[PDB]
Design a protein around this ligand. Structure first.
Ligand SMILES: O=C(CC(=O)c1cccc(OCc2ccccc2)c1)C(=O)N1CCN(C(=O)C(=O)CC(=O)c2cccc(OCc3ccccc3)c2)CC1
Length: 282
């Protein structure tokens, strides 16, 4: 299986080497639009842009740009939209996307503040009576309920298209315990968090793709989607041990750069998939 490979790479301590090959082999596509001058203030990181071929487009003239990519996993039949944590000026764009793409869930893998810095704008209302209105995209966001757990928080939000008065319920899954430095010691919490998102139906095909982000929307976001897809695959095909994490990761990297930012993140991904496979299929 992959656990053997995991214990192997660990034994020889070649994770960094394993990770480098991936980066070297990683796909390279143009990000022209993300580079246009008019979109400079719509990007969080200069080294984190969406490829033109898989970028999500806002359904509006003037500027259809948002730093978000559609990651379509054909075999696993699962799609994810990976994006950057909204900026003070792109919160309206962020929810416009959620609306236009018909997403049911938003997965947040970071805290608004980490390492003493703001890694993301406060894009959702923190109190029921203090709704948020996004004038530019003409949308209203209202906090309906909030369930705070030790490792994550789930919120029910009501998104209303002020233009048509139509409303939709959005589930916000906020993983709040990813350490400021490195990765979690054990994947237990992360897996439970993933299973929670799954059980909500937010990842199901009847809905638009789930929207995932952290700070750059690649490191933790990549780990989340990689783990989910690998587990699905091990559940769908004849021999589960045929699932090649590296292959899946390369496949995903064809849609957005940076997925999995460090060799430590890669190891953790293996660890999550391995442990998750034991829970799913004993
Ligand atoms: O965190 C880092 C470390 C890093 O690699 C980096 C990148 C470019 C320049 C740099 O100076 C040199 C330096 C070295 C050591 C100490 C201070 C300063 C450091 C950071 O100094 N920053 C975050 C965002 N940033 C950038 O220049 C980026 O734009 C980096 C990026 O791509 C990125 C941003 C958020 C998350 C992510 O991946 C998930 C993750 C979660 C937890 C731990 C490790 C990784 C990747 C500016 C400040």
């Amino acid at each position: 299986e992959m656990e053997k490979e995991f214990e192997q790479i660990d034994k020889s301590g070649s994770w960094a080497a394993i990770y480098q090959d991936i980066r070297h082999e990683a796909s390279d596509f143009p990000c022209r639009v993300a580079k246009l001058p008019k979109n400079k203030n719509r990007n969080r990181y200069r080294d984190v842009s969406p490829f033109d071929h898989s970028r999500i487009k806002l359904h509006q003239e003037d500027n259809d740009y948002i730093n978000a990519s559609l990651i379509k996993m054909e075999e696993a039949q699962r799609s994810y939209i990976l994006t950057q944590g909204p900026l003070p000026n792109t919160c309206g764009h962020f929810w416009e996307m959620v609306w236009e793409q018909k997403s049911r869930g938003v997965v947040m893998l970071n805290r608004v503040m980490e390492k003493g810095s703001l890694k993301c704008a406060q894009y959702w209302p923190q109190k029921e009576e203090k709704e948020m209105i996004f004038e530019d995209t003409n949308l209203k966001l209202t906090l309906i309920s909030e369930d705070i757990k030790s490792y994550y928080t789930v919120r029910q939000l009501e998104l209303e298209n002020l233009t048509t008065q139509e409303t939709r319920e959005i589930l916000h899954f906020h993983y709040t315990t990813w350490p400021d430095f490195g990765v979690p010691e054990s994947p237990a919490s992360f897996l439970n968090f993933l299973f929670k998102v799954r059980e909500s139906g937010s990842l199901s095909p009847e809905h638009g793709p789930v929207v995932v982000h952290c700070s750059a929307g690649i490191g933790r976001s990549g780990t989340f989607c990689l783990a989910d897809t690998c587990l699905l695959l091990m559940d769908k095909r004849k021999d589960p041990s045929s699932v090649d994490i590296k292959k899946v990761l390369l496949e995903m990297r064809k849609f957005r750069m940076g997925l999995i930012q460090t060799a430590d993140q890669l190891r953790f991904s293996y660890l999550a998939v391995i442990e998750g496979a034991k829970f799913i299929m004993g």
